[PDB]
Design a protein around this ligand. Sequence first.
Ligand SMILES: [Cl-]
Ligand SMILES: [Cl-]
Lengths: 164, 163
Amino acid sequence: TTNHDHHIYVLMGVSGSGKSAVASEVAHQLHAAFLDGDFLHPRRNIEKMPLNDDDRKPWLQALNDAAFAMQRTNKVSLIVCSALKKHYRDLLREGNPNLSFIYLKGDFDVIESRLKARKKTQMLVTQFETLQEPGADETDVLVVDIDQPLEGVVASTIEVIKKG
Amino acid sequence: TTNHDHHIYVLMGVSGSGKSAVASEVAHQLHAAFLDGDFLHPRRNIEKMASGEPLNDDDRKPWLQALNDAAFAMQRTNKVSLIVCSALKKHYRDLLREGNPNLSFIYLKGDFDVIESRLTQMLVTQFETLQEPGADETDVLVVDIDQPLEGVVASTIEVIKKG
Ligand SMILES: [Cl-]
Ligand SMILES: [Cl-]
């Protein structure tokens, strides 16, 4: 069964919005479970690695199943998944009423500079075109401004998680 | 491709050996990737634990394949990746190793006295299922869990840095 006393937060946003870094630190501070969704891409997906809907299908099912597994024994679970399209989000939501999204939101230049700093440019543009910012119909979406130092993003994400 | 410069450590051992607590802390201190493999279990597998039934080999199969896949995904962009998996049988370990030469195991080892205190019946069954890695398993590093968490964490870090 779904445990309503427990909750899943899917950190979403385009590649470069710092999702893993944020999730890892938040998880550590809240003693929460943490899953970087990027690790569940199918064998085949890693072999290819602008992915398509059919590409993402099995991945999103895996992430839906993982969230279900995580909420059984964890009060708080964080899953990183860009979840750019509303449909991807609805897929994560299936049978998971106790799941919400924390949208790490930033402008193109902020994300572009983080990407340029890492250890692509066109994909980022493509990232933004694909992204459908959650609208008023999605009431389980909380937004955090990533145009701030890492510790601030972390603390904004924590506030968003604790406000309820 | 496999990046032999990168490494995956599967923290193994029976339930109650503190696998998750150690992995979490280690990953954070090292900035390593971390996946608790329990989260990749198929619902049916979850359910057998619901009623308190000990798991089967065919049970564990897709679970292990997905852990194998996750290890391969983790090693592409992380120099150090930690996966929690009890990996009690030698065959489970072999499944995780397939295609992953850069995967080894960190065995959180303790006997029944300790794990019972650190912790009923499943524990007894865990030990029966446990096939302690022998000499034919060279990518197994052993960590004594009969010390505080801080020490376990430190011994685990040392094991990862020795190589
Ligand atoms: Cl990101
Ligand atoms: Cl454990």
